[PDB]
Amino acid sequence: FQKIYSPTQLANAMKLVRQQNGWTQSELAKKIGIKQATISNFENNPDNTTLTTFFKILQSLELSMTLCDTK
């Protein structure tokens, strides 16, 4: 897939995946266990965002991550 190198191109990519799936910030927030506010913070200000948060939301998107070389 496409290599991500920052919190912002990250949040962007995931927010994309949410929209292209018809999910709202609310339903994902319920499934996992965080408030709708957090998802919104993550999407617009991912810099100061926790790792558990990020994985929580990763899970709610039926997604996963993997490392690789930057070439």
Binding site: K30, K31, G33, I34, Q59, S60
Partner: protein, 414 residues
């Protein structure tokens, strides 16, 4: 001598017992790079050096039986150099729980990869009754239990590094074998993921035969594979001396957070809570850390493994001293005053109190309680109507009775 650790005929690394009595492990470089690469145990994350922490000892320890008597039982049989974990595993190393195959360094001695002796009805009656008063296996758990391989229509004994397909349990509780065989049929009927168990009858003896979920025939049907796994004490690298929360073991919060890392996190998280209700319904109090396992998957991934080792603490009331008010869950729920655990004092508000702190989807706690509310009755019927003609109607009666008693507490709200 070091124990070479194998996993389905793959060289993982080596257990080494130092002069100081020091247990240590080093992954084999060829394993760190393998396709199938994964840590033996989550408490032992892939890395390069010699691992020296307590997790190494505790992990391997949690492969042998709980009771140190069972242990002497083993230092006798296969003449062990000690009751030490290393020394015992150097005898019954082959078919251990999970997937690990510990074979001494001085011992390629490769095991017939696929070999078995088709047992007779008397040989069986002998092995079954035996565990009361080539078979290099190891079963970890609360009670006395062996394991066998079912092929075709005969119960055979594995020979070599030949895996087993059934965990067979002997009657200890007066009818443990019957209690659990009920609990399982029930848990399946209610959608919970448990293994198909059958009852085997050998002359006089009566044993339970549980299908292993940590075993699977390869595609060709030519090789029996062991699936790597570990329980909640191994995962947190704790000694089996703390499997119960009341002793320092992991509880709901602990397990739940962890599950968040599962491959099937949201599903696992649900099932787990759900199982916290089930155990409450059938008054099961054996819900300790060593009774929950995760499968270990390529890369280090894990998902919750089916539920196992289910027994109901109901057929043990009244005529003895035990009473419903003395039944306490292994893992506590969030209460008004601290944490409540007494089955007969537990109510739906408690499960919802718990979900509340754990931040488990309140709506899903509502759906779980609700599903149980309207299924229990139908379940009990279908299970009862399955119980073989020779099934102790008191076990049925005792369980089926209190379940409804508790179930009432549900229907009255859902």
């Amino acid at each position: 001598p070091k124990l070479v650790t194998w996993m389905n005929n793959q060289r993982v690394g080596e257990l080494t017992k130092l002069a100081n009595g020091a247990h240590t492990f080093k992954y084999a470089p060829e394993w760190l790079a393998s396709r199938y690469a994964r840590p033996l145990s989550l408490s032992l994350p892939l890395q390069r050096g010699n691992i020296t922490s307590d997790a190494v000892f505790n992990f391997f320890d949690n492969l042998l039986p709980d009771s140190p008597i069972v242990r002497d039982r083993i230092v006798k049989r296969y003449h062990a150099k000690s009751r030490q974990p290393f020394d015992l595993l150097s005898e019954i190393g082959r078919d251990s729980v999970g997937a690990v195959t510990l074979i001494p360094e001085d011992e390629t001695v490769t095991h017939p990869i696929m070999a078995w002796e088709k047992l007779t009805e008397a040989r069986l009656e002998e092995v079954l009754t035996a565990y009361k008063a080539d078979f290099r296996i190891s079963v970890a758990g609360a009670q006395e239990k062996t394991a066998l391989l079912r092929i075709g229509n005969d119960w055979c004994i594995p020979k070599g590094i030949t895996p087993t397909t059934h965990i067979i349990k002997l009657p200890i509780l007066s009818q443990s074998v019957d209690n659990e065989y009920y609990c399982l049929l029930l848990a399946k009927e209610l959608g919970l993921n448990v293994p198909d168990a059958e009852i085997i009858k050998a002359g006089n003896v009566r044993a339970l035969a549980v299908e292993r979920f940590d075993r699977r025939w390869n595609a060709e049907r030519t090789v029996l594979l062991r699936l790597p796994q570990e329980d909640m004490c191994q995962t947190f690298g704790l000694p089996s001396s703390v499997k119960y929360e009341s002793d320092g073991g992991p509880g709901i919060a602990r397990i739940m957070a962890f599950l968040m890392g599962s491959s099937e996190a949201l599903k696992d998280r649900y099932d787990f809570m759900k199982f916290q209700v089930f155990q409450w319904l059938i008054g099961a109090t054996q819900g300790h850390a060593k009774n929950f396992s995760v499968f270990i998957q390529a890369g280090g991934s894990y998902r919750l493994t089916p539920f196992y080792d289910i027994i109901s603490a109901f057929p043990v009331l009244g005529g003895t001293g035990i009473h419903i008010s003395d039944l306490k869950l292994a893992m506590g729920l969030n209460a008004s005053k601290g944490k409540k655990t007494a089955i007969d004092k537990i109510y739906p508000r408690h499960f919802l109190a718990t979900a509340k702190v754990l931040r488990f989807p309140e709506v899903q706690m509502h759906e779980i309680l609700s599903d149980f509310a309207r299924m229990i009755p139908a379940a009990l019927d279908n299970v009862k109507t399955s119980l073989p003609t020779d099934f102790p109607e008191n076990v049925v009666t005792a369980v089926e009775s209190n379940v409804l008693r508790l179930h009432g507490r549900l229907s009255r709200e859902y």
